[PDB]
Subunit: 233 residues, 3 copies
Amino acid sequence: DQEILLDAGAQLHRLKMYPYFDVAHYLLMIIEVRDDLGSAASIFSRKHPLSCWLSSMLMCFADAFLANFLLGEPVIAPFKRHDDIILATIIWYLVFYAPFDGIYKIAKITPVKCVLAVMKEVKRAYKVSHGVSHAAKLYPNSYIVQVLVGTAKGAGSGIVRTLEQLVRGVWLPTHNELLRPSFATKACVVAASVLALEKSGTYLTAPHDLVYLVIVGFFVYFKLSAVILHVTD
Amino acid sequence: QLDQEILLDAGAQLHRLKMYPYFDVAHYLLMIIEVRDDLGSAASIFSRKHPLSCWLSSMLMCFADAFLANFLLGEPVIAPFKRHDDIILATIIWYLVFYAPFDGIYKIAKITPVKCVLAVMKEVKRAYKVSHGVSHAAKLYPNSYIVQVLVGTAKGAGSGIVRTLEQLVRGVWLPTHNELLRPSFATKACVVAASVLALEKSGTYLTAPHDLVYLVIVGFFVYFKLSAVILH
Amino acid sequence: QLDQEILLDAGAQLHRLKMYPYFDVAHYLLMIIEVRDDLGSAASIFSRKHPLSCWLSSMLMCFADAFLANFLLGEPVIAPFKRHDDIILATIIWYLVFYAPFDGIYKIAKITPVKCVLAVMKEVKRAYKVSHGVSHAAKLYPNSYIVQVLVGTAKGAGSGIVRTLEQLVRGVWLPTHNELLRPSFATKACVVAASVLALEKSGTYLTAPHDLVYLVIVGFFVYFKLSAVILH
Ligand SMILES: CCCCCCCCCCO[C@@H]1O[C@H](CO)[C@@H](O[C@H]2O[C@H](CO)[C@@H](O)[C@H](O)[C@H]2O)[C@H](O)[C@H]1O
Ligand SMILES: [Ca+2]
């Protein structure tokens, strides 16, 4: 059975994010930006589009904004990648202005959400990885920094969310999407510890493709266990 | 016929026109005035009991756009405190608005006409700012037009964000930011303007001297501000 | 002649004095105790149930001045996490203050004598911070003296800003940042000792021994801290 696994991992590693995983992410995030505008969503979206778009972009690339800040790199940075900004703006356009509010309505249907919900955990596992990597690039010896920046990209979307609100002058602790994503932060810490530990090389043995597999496996295990344990109540 | 002519003259002298030291004293003046007004009934006893804290905030607001521009571009937010000239001039105005004899400087700025010129002057400077924002940005990311747009807009409208973080840090909240509700259009003005300049620099499809456009946009920043001064 | 030598010898030894680890275990010690208290009644449950959050909240407060300093200067704010020996030591004090057996380390720090001892050392530690802030600012921009001062003051008495933003992100507003009234003399003392050291390095307007002047401030920060315990 092993073979097939190392084939799973070797492929996983090669798996690109653009554009399906991205659009899954951008989709879930912006649908939330909308959902949180409370009843005001409809009116605000129509009279303050830029202000609305900006809030959506902050949440789509929140992990980057956060890492950059942590790393002394220019926060504006995420706006160089025209590819991503475009795609997200499109997804942004649809969630707020799609005809017959279709796209919004389709994502909200149970089976679909779940696909997305999973796809996203793959994109997260990916971010946790690229964080620890970039971290170890600039600071190969400082493991803590690697683990933080990793956990930063894996779960720091909440912080950017809080900051955006405090600036819009609105407090909204519905910060409980699922009361479960709290698993996200701990998961991202261990997930990052490992990759951080593995890159140093000093103490663990097994192929990256195989370990990264198990962590993406877990992320998906839980984000499902959050979807499936919510539904029974 | 005659209208096309007159366009070039203003630009030349406009572009030659240094904001310093009069536009800076206009701007500083208004900003530090506002810092004093939002200080409410307290303002009076605060300025005297905590001159430094009073100063910093005033400093923060005079150069707010700078502090933001830097942060966004990774640059040291401390940098504005380097230009010793700007800080000295500003601090003077600061000193006046809060401690002028018979609080004269403050009042003279209050009258409908004066306060209206200080404001029209501030509009040119703001444009001056959106210009420098787009340029410095384009200089670093010659082809990341969004970034340039954002930074220019930040440069021309970002005072609000700094204002907010300062209050948060001081544990106080006043959503009454929009003294006028044009400033939500002001930012929009800055956004369209900034992205106009971002286009010029790209060098794609555009015919008009640089001295011609800076003046055309000023007409709009002044027009929106004037449309805000006439009504109420 | 007879006693002119006793004071000159103290400046050389203070210069020889390391901060690690007896001063740090004081500073980290105090800082982390405050983190604990502020969690209020829930402090107990929260520390057991959310050890990580609690830890990061601590580290933020132990190295606050660094974070603020880095941020200001344009440097990577995550930087102070590279110093393993510190995070290591600081984490121990953290472990102790929160989960010590019979909670001894915490109690010991509570007695008026010990809290007093620690209080002073930390003050030496501050002196230290103010210094390097002025230094490192001067290293990069030795002519911009304001920056050297803000950065010195930030470094010296800026943990309050970090505390504020930490609460804002935690969704709590415990504005009673006011433990003692001294942390109000703390920021000003830091502002002076900053401008004094920023002057020294300029050397342009006065000559004085580096070990005497540094020794005087260290005593002055301790003076104000003593006045808090001996006067009230
Ligand atoms: C070397 C690796 C170490 C780096 C790891 C990064 C640190 C992890 C931070 C996540 O910790 C979070 O802290 C929050 C505090 O803001 C908790 O809020 C929770 O608990 C609070 C009370 O303490 C409630 O007010 C909130 O509603 C509730 O969500 C949240 O659950 C917890 O996940
Ligand atoms: Ca509140």
